[PDB]
Amino acid sequence: MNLKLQLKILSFLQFCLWGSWLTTLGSYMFVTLKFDGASIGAVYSSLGIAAVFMPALLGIVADKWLSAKWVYAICHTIGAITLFMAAQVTTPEAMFLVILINSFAYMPTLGLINTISYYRLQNAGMDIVTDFPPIRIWGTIGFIMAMWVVSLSGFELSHMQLYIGAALSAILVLFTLTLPHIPVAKQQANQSWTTLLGLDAFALFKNKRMAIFFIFSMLLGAELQITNMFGNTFLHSFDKDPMFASSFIVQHASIIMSISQISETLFILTIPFFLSRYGIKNVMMISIVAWILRFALFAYGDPTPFGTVLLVLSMIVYGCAFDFFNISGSVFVEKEVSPAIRASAQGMFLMMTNGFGCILGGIVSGKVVEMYTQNGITDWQTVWLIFAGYSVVLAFAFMAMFKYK
Numbered sequence: 001m002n003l004k005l006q007l008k009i010l011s012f013l014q015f016c017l018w019g020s021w022l023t024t025l026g027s028y029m030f031v032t033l034k035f036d037g038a039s040i041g042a043v044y045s046s047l048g049i050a051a052v053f054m055p056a057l058l059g060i061v062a063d064k065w066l067s068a069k070w071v072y073a074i075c076h077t078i079g080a081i082t083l084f085m086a087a088q089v090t091t092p093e094a095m096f097l098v099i100l101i102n103s104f105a106y107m108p109t110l111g112l113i114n115t116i117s118y119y120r121l122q123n124a125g126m127d128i129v130t131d132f133p134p135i136r137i138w139g140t141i142g143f144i145m146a147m148w149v150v151s152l153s154g155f156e157l158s159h160m161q162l163y164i165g166a167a168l169s170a171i172l173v174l175f176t177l178t179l180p181h182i183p184v185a186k187q188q189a190n191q192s193w194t195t196l197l198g199l200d201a202f203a204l205f206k207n208k209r210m211a212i213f214f215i216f217s218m219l220l221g222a223e224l225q226i227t228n229m230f231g232n233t234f235l236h237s238f239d240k241d242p243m244f245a246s247s248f249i250v251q252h253a254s255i256i257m258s259i260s261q262i263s264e265t266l267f268i269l270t271i272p273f274f275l276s277r278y279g280i281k282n283v284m285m286i287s288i289v290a291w292i293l294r295f296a297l298f299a300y301g302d303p304t305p306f307g308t309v310l311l312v313l314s315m316i317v318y319g320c321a322f323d324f325f326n327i328s329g330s331v332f333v334e335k336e337v338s339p340a341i342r343a344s345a346q347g348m349f350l351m352m353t354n355g356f357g358c359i360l361g362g363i364v365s366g367k368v369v370e371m372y373t374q375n376g377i378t379d380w381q382t383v384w385l386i387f388a389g390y391s392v393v394l395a396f397a398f399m400a401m402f403k404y405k
């Protein structure tokens with residue numbers, strides 16, 4: 001096999017297994033397994049708890065000299081067995097457990113694939129700087145195509161998606177064997193990204209200013225993944241309306257929610273411009289307004305003609321909110337760091353924001369959906385408005401932060 005082909009298939013398989021179930025797992029638990037939003041949020045909460053430990057296990061791989069190929073293979077083997085059980089759990093606490101084990105195996109993969117590909121491309125004498133972007137993009141292509149194929153086959157509400165993920169994890173394992181051998185000795189002299197984490201990178205919390213900032217960014221990020229968790233559940237909620245039971249957006253919610261990940265990818269191209277044109281605080285503010293718009297368009301969104309427009313426009317707006325918030329937060333955080341602490345500040349901003357925001361937001365949004373569900377019916381308008389108001393006030397807290405001197 002061509003090595004570029006191999007790494008592309010590897011990247012595609014890496015996210016196509018995750019996207020088979022990750023968006024639709026909530027509505028599977030809600031509509032099929034009849035969970036409440038609090039336990040669905042709890043189950044989604046495990047990914048944050050795994051992600052927050054992911055630097056530790058990647059660090060032990062580097063330190064006690066484990067091979068990324070083989071660790072990657074063992075980790076996907078655990079991921080496949082785990083999704084295989086997931087298609088069988090039926091009770092929430094067990095779902096949280098198997099998803100906990102699955103997230104613990106899978107998250108360390110977000111780093112192992114990058115490690116694998118850098119050294120394999122260098123082994124072949126290839127350009128890492130220009131060849132990584134064509135490989136990494138197949139992962140998003142795979143994630144979207146998994147969403148789409150599972151949605152089209154009729155497995156949005158089934159546990160078949162978990163079997164699809166189990167099968168794709170297993171194929172990923174056995175294709176993973178074929179990869180070239182690279183001595184772990186060849187991987188030396190390179191300081192791990194994980195070493196810029198660890199327990200002295202909390203030194204950045206010496207500054208009360210930056211500390212308060214990180215807390216608001218943790219708070220703000222607490223809602224970064226809410227509509228990946230629940231927009232599918234909300235879009236299926238139109239089944240009670242017989243006008244909309246038939247609707248493609250109601251039956252095929254994953255293709256209508258795919259616009260968000262697509263916008264997430266293509267809005268990365270507009271970031272250099274808005275960073276240059278407006279600057280850091282401004283981009284943070286536009287991020288915030290885009291999250292307010294994102295939630296409010298969900299509150300007033302229907303499978304109707306105008307409702308569909310509002311839904312599709314918030315799906316477009318999500319990519320702006322997500323991309324812009326990570327870039328401007330990373331860069332602002334960096335701008336107020338000693339130039340030595342600067343890579344570690346970006347690392348802590350992302351794991352604090354997304355990793356800790358994911359635990360916090362999972363449990364929180366779940367309790368919100370549970371509160372506004374009565375008789376099995378969620379009042380998505382009140383839920384979406386709650387989060388939109390939270391978005392608004394986070395706008396005011398960030399403005400108060402930026403104008404304080």
